[PDB]
From a paper:
β-galactosidases (E.C. 3.2.1.23) catalyze the hydrolysis of lactose into glucose and galactose, as well as the transgalactosylation of prebiotic galacto-oligosaccharides. Halorubrum lacusprofundi, a completely sequenced extremely halophilic archaeon isolated from Deep Lake Antarctica is an attractive system for detailed structural and functional analysis of protein adaptation in extreme conditions and of special interest for astrobiology. We demonstrate that hla_bga combines features enabling halophily with a fine-tuned protein flexibility to enhance catalysis at low temperatures. Based on hydrophobic cluster analysis, amino acid sequence similarities, the conservation of catalytic residues and reaction mechanisms, hla_bga is classified as a member of the glycoside hydrolase (GH) family 42.
To understand the molecular features that enable hla_bga to adapt to high salinity/low temperature polyextremophilic conditions, we determined the crystal structure of hla_bga at a resolution of 2.5 Å, using the molecular replacement method. As a trimer, hla_bga resembles a bowl with a central opening that has a width of about 25 Å at the rim, ~40 Å in the center and 7 Å at the bottom. The three monomers of hla_bga are tightly bound to each other by extensive hydrogen bonding. Each chain of hla_bga has 18 hydrogen bonds and four salt bridges that contribute to the inter-chain interactions The solvent-accessible surface area buried in the trimer structure of hla_bga is 10,083 Å2, which constitutes 43.1% of the trimer surface area. Finally, hla_bga contains two unusual surface loop regions, one in domain B (residues 532–543) and the other in domain C (656–674). These two loop regions contained an increased number of acidic amino acids (42% in the loop region compared to 18.6% overall protein structure), illustrating the convolution of halophilic and psychrophilic features. It is particularly pronounced at the hla_bga surface, displaying 33.6% acidic residues.
Author numbering:
A (entry chain A), B (entry chain A), C (entry chain A): 1 to 531, 544 to 656, 673 to 696
The structure:
Amino acid sequence: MRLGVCYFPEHWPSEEWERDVAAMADAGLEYVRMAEFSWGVLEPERGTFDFEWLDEAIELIGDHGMQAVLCTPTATPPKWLVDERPSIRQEDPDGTVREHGSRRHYCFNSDAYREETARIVERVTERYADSPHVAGWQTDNEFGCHETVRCYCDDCADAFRTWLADRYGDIDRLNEAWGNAFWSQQYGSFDEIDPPGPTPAEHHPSRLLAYARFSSDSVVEYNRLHADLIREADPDWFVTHNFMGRFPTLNAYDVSEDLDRVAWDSYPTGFVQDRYDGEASPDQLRAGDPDQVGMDHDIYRSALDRPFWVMEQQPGDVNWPPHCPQPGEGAMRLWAHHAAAHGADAVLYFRWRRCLEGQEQYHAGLRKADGSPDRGYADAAHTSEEFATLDGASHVDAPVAVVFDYDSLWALNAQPHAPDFDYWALQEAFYGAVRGRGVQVDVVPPSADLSGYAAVVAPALHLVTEDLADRLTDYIAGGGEVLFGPRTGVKDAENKLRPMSQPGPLTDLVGATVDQHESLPRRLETTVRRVPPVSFRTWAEWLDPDAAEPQYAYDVDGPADGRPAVVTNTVGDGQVTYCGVWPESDLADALASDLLDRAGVRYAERLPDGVRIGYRGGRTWVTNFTSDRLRLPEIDPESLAVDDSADGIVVGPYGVAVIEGDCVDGLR
Amino acid sequence: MRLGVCYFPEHWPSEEWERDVAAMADAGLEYVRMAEFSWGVLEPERGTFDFEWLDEAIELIGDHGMQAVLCTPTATPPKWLVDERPSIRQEDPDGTVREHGSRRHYCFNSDAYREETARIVERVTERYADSPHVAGWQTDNEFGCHETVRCYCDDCADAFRTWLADRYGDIDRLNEAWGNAFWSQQYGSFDEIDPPGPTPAEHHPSRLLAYARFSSDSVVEYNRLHADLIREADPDWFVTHNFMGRFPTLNAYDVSEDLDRVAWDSYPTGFVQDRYDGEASPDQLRAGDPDQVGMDHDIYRSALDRPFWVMEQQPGDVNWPPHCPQPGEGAMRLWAHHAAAHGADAVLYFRWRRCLEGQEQYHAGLRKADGSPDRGYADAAHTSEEFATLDGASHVDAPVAVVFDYDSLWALNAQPHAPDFDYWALQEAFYGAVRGRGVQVDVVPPSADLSGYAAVVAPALHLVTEDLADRLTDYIAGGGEVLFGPRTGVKDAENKLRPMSQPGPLTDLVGATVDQHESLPRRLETTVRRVPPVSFRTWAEWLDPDAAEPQYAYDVDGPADGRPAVVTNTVGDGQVTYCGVWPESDLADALASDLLDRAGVRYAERLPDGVRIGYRGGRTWVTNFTSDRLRLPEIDPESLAVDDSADGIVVGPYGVAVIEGDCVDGLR
Amino acid sequence: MRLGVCYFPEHWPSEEWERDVAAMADAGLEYVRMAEFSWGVLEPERGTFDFEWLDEAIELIGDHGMQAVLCTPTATPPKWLVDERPSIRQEDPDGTVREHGSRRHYCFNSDAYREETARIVERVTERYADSPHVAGWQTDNEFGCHETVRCYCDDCADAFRTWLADRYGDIDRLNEAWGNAFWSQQYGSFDEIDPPGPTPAEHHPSRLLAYARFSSDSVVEYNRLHADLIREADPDWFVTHNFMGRFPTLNAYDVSEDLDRVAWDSYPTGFVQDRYDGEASPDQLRAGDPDQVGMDHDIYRSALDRPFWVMEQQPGDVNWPPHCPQPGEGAMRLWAHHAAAHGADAVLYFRWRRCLEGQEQYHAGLRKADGSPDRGYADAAHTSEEFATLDGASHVDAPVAVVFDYDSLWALNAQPHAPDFDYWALQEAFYGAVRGRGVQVDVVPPSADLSGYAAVVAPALHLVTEDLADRLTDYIAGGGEVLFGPRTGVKDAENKLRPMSQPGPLTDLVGATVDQHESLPRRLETTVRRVPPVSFRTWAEWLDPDAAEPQYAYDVDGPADGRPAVVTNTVGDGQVTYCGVWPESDLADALASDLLDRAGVRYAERLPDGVRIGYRGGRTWVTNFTSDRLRLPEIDPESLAVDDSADGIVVGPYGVAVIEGDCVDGLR
Ligand SMILES: [Mg+2]
Ligand SMILES: [Mg+2]
Ligand SMILES: [Mg+2]
Ligand SMILES: [Zn+2]
Ligand SMILES: [Zn+2]
Ligand SMILES: [Zn+2]
């Protein structure tokens, strides 16, 4: 709908200021976000303040018809503050303090930093509460980036001890809940508990999961401090945060419980590089992967059951990934329309102009170093016009749900049982099989209500609380069916095994138990056939069908030969399928298409690997991350978003096509 | 002969206790080992003790006819003790203290820990000295695991200084023995010597070897403290320890000098993964490598010249190696019979039931999580019956010897001169060539007497003491012949070069000197022909035949072309062959078969790669780690151990076959 | 011209002393360098001194007709000094002190060490000022080796603060020159600046470049202390230093500004191993790469515009590289003649005899361990005779120049924008293309005067000072043409971007601007054709020809398809070509041959990959690093240096051929 850009008047002289806001008006960007790293300029020394620049900045943003979203400067305390109160910095487990010289050099549990966040944010919000045309506020900047969610300092130790006391009540319930008899790891009292440090072997899984939950909850409380004082300033303002893609350390659900709108930063070409399982391909090197960006879009939309923003959007070549080839022609228009299809009503590009200045010189902006426009500006203008023309897009609703569980993520990160195992890649297999049929997908936590969904897929439900278990049993008994992936129903809320066999509380919600599991180097032939041969990847679980009906068996020809691999069971009205195998493309597509068959939804035929389509409101969007070409027959030119006989429409490389009418179709 | 299991009543409720000991009686396991990690349960706080559970435990083990072997709880001091006396923990070279949160968090040289080992072990042995049916005692648990042999704390510094003074007498003998003039590294006094810490370049080889010897001797004295007080408790008891496979940091010979029986922990599928040189193959992924497990069996048997135990045996899937595929059908029966062939009279499986509890949840037991039996239980029962039926097996004696020298191992670990060089792999090449002919092999230190051996193979004798040198000269003059590998006769007892050329004290016990040596990336063609072409690996030493007779020359076609590679010489009665080359399979087999020719022993024809046979007492065992099948004609069905015309016997995948009669044969 | 050896009488008994100096006379080595690591022997305790050995040593070196070059023992302070004043040692960023146990364990900024360098060097030079036959002095030993240029201790912190104050005057000029507004990184005062330590993300580029310049300048001042007191001792003496190959941390130009002769250590087989981009080939494993050793030869010759020495030369197999295969037959004669061709008048081999002693036992010498000669001795004798026969070789002058900029090196090391990017490899591509035509090349800093050069090549001029810019414009306007590589004209003296587009101050000295740049994984097809198809590597810069004339365009067929890749422009008299691409062998050779066409120099036809020729004085040298054979027709046998009809001369594997007459030729 609306577009924007992340501006930094801090770096540029004030002569360029109004001409640049004028260009930002020319492009059609109705939002401008600044003041992230402006603490050092505002307070050069303690007691001295320099607000006026931002005032004029806001003025010009309001002079040209855009509303500016401001942010707390907490991400970068200046050097005088760090030298003044060194206790604010964090420590990694062996105790080395993460110094100044970059961003994110503070600890979420140091009461000192709480005091001075209070001071600085109080003074910056009271300057702007009622009068000016600021739109809302965003918390610090990318909470927990550079692995700053978990600190092992002594302030975190005290916070950990009281968090533990609050969770468990007394020491004996902790010892029996984690079960500390193995390797005589019982705690005599809560003080005897230290944040995990260097030790000869692995750390206790319940201990590590407790510390992960503790770190994420610490940052949730810090964010609530932020949001409390922001709401204190002006009741109309929204509070929001910019999260990151494929980020494991911060539970965005609970922190989003404290805000009004959700935002995140997407850089497709960079994240397709970061050992996205397998070698990043050229078209991926220039456009990214539609499914990684898409799952992040869905996870941040379904946070509040409301549309989201993308607070930072890749403008061109960036600096952090190993290589950064030039993205394809119109890749930014492509990403904007991708986010718009996935639910974003605002897309703000980072940044306005390439910074000549810091350790991000190799990060482009919508403008060059000259003040000349970069490719980002042109594509931003084009997507602006098309966003205007296509309607006041509604909030998508997904018929299918995938349950994303940060606790399962952390617990398996602690115990992968394979070097090539990754929760992100598993959820990606299942979710991308569902999206390869063309549906809109919702990814949610166990907290959400599973009613109102045709089908649900739970690739990893590692820890199953029994309330969650009977909720799913009643959903499958009364409503649609479910597809569970491998490694679900293994541990409890305390990351502990059950006296029963896998999948514990779900064992009767499926037709089988699990004899045992094995982890496989991806060097062995790993196939399944149906009881045609498809291959699976990295993981196998032998199914003991006690209730009923194996579907796929192992043609692996090892010691698991001929044993059930996939299973189905019809408990009452509605079904349940269990996949004890990490499926490759074909098997996952078969499972997805069949579950979609069972739930009367309108899956399109197998869309190509770099082609994704989504129905928002009434219109439907086809985003082409492939650089070849696409041709959809069966649809004549009545499309709203088109580029500059009736044989369909042709969607060029990195192009979008918005069409109305919720299709069941194929293409190229 | 007898079977067992490592039980932990600590984890399980006492209602399952007698039913589980009843099942352990059903399987036929006459030994039960517990109390390893029970310090935290016994002494929850200082002065408070909780013995009674173990009492009843022992009672039930004695109620059902099995003798229980107990162990000191020293491996895991509880948190209250660590917080009480933090000085007990270790430090790695840069000085970071290895905290609590795992096992093995103590230092062998901290007098504090000596005091409290005295306290706890005194109190636990006096509880059981004369009266109950405990069988013997095992020291802590896997001494030095997780790299805990070498600590760099200050207590170790004092222990190192006095160990050095005891070895060298005065500072000047140390300086001249290590020769500290290079890089002006001379010590003015013994206090000027610090345990090795961070330094810009490598560390002195004599210094590092001194510290390795010092760490291992420190743990030998700790073990002698243990054994002294155990023998103090009951004169009948045996003292033993559980060592590890392919473990370089602890000299098991000298610590075994302090005990009565030797035991070790075998997990074949896991250790075949740990960069066992080359990619672990599928049949290896499910059965392991017969030669690695076999050399460990031999090294721990020949420790006391007595049979050994395998205190921990893989029950199924385990947790530590990167991947853990399900082992083959009957792999545990296979490992039990493998150890029985190699000399083990007791084989105790770890553990009884998969622990639901600690950081080893992914480690199976003989029973499932349900209390249901796992594959391990069934295979344990089957091997129990066959162990009963085949006789009261004798102690094997080997005709051939391989000299394993921990000092050579440490010295070459400090100076590999190649990234792909490994003492384990070299000894494996030679030993496996000998075993591929079907013999029983003894692996011993230079301390042992070399008489009573048809032939001897010394792959790496890096440090040759002159007493050892004339012992070998008299052995070769009066008795059998020897085969020396590369890098023998290079340094003295002080890890220092000789003024002479290689191999120093042995130069006249062989026909040649060594012109020079080269290290080779395994990318170049590395062949030898005899003076048909076989390939060698990673190492070459040009031989200068001064006395006599090159056998193999270099067809490598480099600057070493045509120079002697292998050599033979007949000093008196009996011969000596020197292999200045790391031989691949074919060359090593030729050398092994020929040395066996020279010593009138009964080598069988080349057995397949995953097939190993051994003659214990009167019976001989063929263990098949291959999953194909095996067929031995020339032997009709009179076999003792067989699975459930006369064309031989067929040994299926992962099967054993015990036959009587010391064969010279081939197979499949 | 003259040969030598690096002797250590410290290790050997004095009985071998005169026989070894006699052998050194036999070989013809007129220089002997000792006293590097002799501090521990000289001063065993403080106040006690033991000079006499060296006296006799010098005597014998003078008794047999050779002049001995001595060195300060500063590289290895003994243990008593380190224990006495521990503050002398260095610290790496997280603060761990680099202990004793190796060499180079001192800090260049600790005033303590300045005091005791003064003490020890004063006492060692006054012992020898006027009377004896020592030739000159060499500073410590390989300054900064094992990464000891940059220390992060507190003494370095104070030195850094005052160096910064001296460079910038006040804090505000530093903040605006580095531009510290990004991530609020401004400094309130110079004390607020700490040497870079652990921080969650990257460090500021200007900050890191400042610290690199600071470390190198610190060692320049330490070297000036050394040289000042050496010149104080005897006015006739020369001061020199031994630098290293491919060494990035020490600016040899500025330290050479303080000495009279330049020396360096060449080990070709070892450095061709150290991830010299690509797999080191067999002939490289035995001879090295002529271009890496050659560029180091040129960089150390052009330091003072005078000939150089090679203070350490590989004698045979060495210890530091991963593998060390035996070098080819006569490889040392080959290296000696290679250095002689490149300008070395003295070549001193390290070392005399393999040290039996320290952590370098696996490093050969010219003699074996026996005191027997090694291959090095024979080849040293042969190259001695030929050096005598061929004339009193002059100082080479190069017609072409390559600008090597340590600041560009450090700045791109901080921001490679690619994992496979390396300043050494880029300069190697261009320089080796020039040498593959057979010319002599000079590699110099921007400090040197560019007049007197037919053509100049600047592969990376990352930071262009405007004085440098107008110097190059006037050179191209009045004289020859230039070839600029990628990533030149990007930042200023402060490592900051310009408000203009690339290449900033050079934008009108070339026909184009730079649209943008991309980094490429070497997995994509990366070609160019001329406006036949050659391939490029790892880097591309789209050229916007505003002034004139693209030569090569992109046949890569991506989003950069058809855009100019190489460009040429004729500003006045003389031309300029810009290569926005990292060229592979063929493209680089085309560019080199064409620039040589433009400058009327006598390039020979494409010489093979392991063949290098150079014209020193009147004679010209062809060094064959290839092991095949070479045949030069068109030249009959009148050659001066030849090995033991008229169809040319044949140069065998690893042979030299010195011929007179400055050729334009081809070969094999
Ligand atoms: Mg700690
Ligand atoms: Mg230390
Ligand atoms: Mg610091
Ligand atoms: Zn912290
Ligand atoms: Zn210690
Ligand atoms: Zn320092």
